[PDB]
Design a protein around this nucleic acid. Structure first.
Ligand SMILES: Nc1ncnc2c1ncn2[C@H]1C[C@H](O)[C@@H](COP(=O)(O)OP(=O)(O)OP(=O)(O)O)O1
Ligand SMILES: [Ca+2]
Length: 270
DNA sequence: ATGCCTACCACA
DNA sequence: GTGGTAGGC
């Protein structure tokens, strides 16, 4: 309720101011886009598009995964797109990983990713009995000369988290040995620009309706798009009916939890 | 016409 | 300890 009231209170504050089957609908307000989704029989999802302005202004788009990919895959249009991870929606385990390269000259980013996956896979086994390995982790890279940047999206067989807030509670729980510095989790500690210690794992992405940059999109002011990392070990099952790139796209979507008649939903309370 | 929220510091 | 905020995702 405390979270539902504050959101609805922004709606009252904002209130102060034949053909082929297709569902391409744009909205200025995120709440309007979700109101349309609930009022829509098809399986549509909310995307966020960065506006040309240098700020973080966003315009929200509702459509199906398939139609979005159709108009998105050429990378000629819809640059700088984000997935809106809906609050209270089941979601995959995912990570935002970063550190300043000049400020961490000794750090081996590739090694840190493998160690993190190893530890997270142990925690999933000890706390939930879930078995997985690096072969289940989609590894996306957006690194620059200055920044080591990865997105990991776990592809767990018939398993998902209740919502992305629970993902955050799970990570805060198992990374507590590392947060205390700010099990031996010293490898996660990195320096920011100002020499202030931080964790390699960005915990700020587990918030309600978090935007999460799409596979093959870049930030508005930049040119580096998220692409599959060379050391990626998750390979989707190939199908004669869909392209491999579409399969990677669907795997990369945090909110695109594979339908299963034996799905287990993992919760983690604060 | 973006949304979210913790870390941080000043006050009983 | 809470406010109470603005700085960062
Ligand atoms: N100003 C914002 N408004 C809304 N959502 C945001 C904003 N900044 C970041 N986000 C969301 C989208 C990002 O994909 C996600 C993580 O932030 P961040 O690490 O800065 O970007 P990123 O991981 O997409 O690129 P990179 O780290 O390579 O610069 O949080
Ligand atoms: Ca990042």
């Amino acid at each position: 309720m405390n979270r539902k009231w504050e959101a609805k209170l922004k709606q009252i504050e904002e209130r102060a101011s034949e053909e082929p089957p297709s569902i391409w609908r744009l909205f200025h307000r995120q709440a309007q886009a979700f109101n349309f989704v609930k009022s829509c029989k098809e399986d549509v999802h909310v995307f966020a598009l960065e506006c040309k302005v240098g700020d973080g202004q966003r315009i929200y788009l509702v459509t199906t995964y398939a139609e979005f990919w159709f108009y998105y895959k050429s990378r000629k249009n819809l640059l700088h797109c984000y997935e809106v991870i809906p609050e209270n929606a089941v979601c995959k385990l995912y990570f935002d990983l970063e550190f300043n390269k000049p400020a961490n000259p000794g750090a081996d980013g590739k090694k840190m990713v493998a160690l993190l996956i190893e530890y997270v896979c142990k925690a999933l086994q000890e706390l939930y009995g879930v078995n997985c390995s690096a072969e289940d982790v989609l590894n996306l890279d957006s690194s620059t000369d200055e920044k080591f940047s990865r997105h990991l999206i776990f592809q767990l067989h018939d398993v998902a988290f209740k919502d992305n807030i629970h993902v955050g509670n799970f990570l805060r729980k198992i990374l507590q040995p590392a947060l205390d510095l700010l099990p031996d989790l010293s490898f996660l500690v990195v320096k920011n620009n100002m020499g202030e210690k931080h964790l390699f794992v960005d915990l700020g992405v587990y918030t309600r309706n978090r935007n999460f940059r799409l596979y093959k999109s870049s930030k508005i002011g930049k040119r580096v798009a998220l692409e599959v990392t060379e050391d990626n070990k998750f390979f989707p099952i190939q199908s004669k009916d869909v392209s491999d790139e579409y399969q990677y796209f669907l795997s990369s979507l945090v909110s695109n939890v594979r339908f299963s008649d034996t799905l287990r939903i993992l919760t983690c309370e604060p």
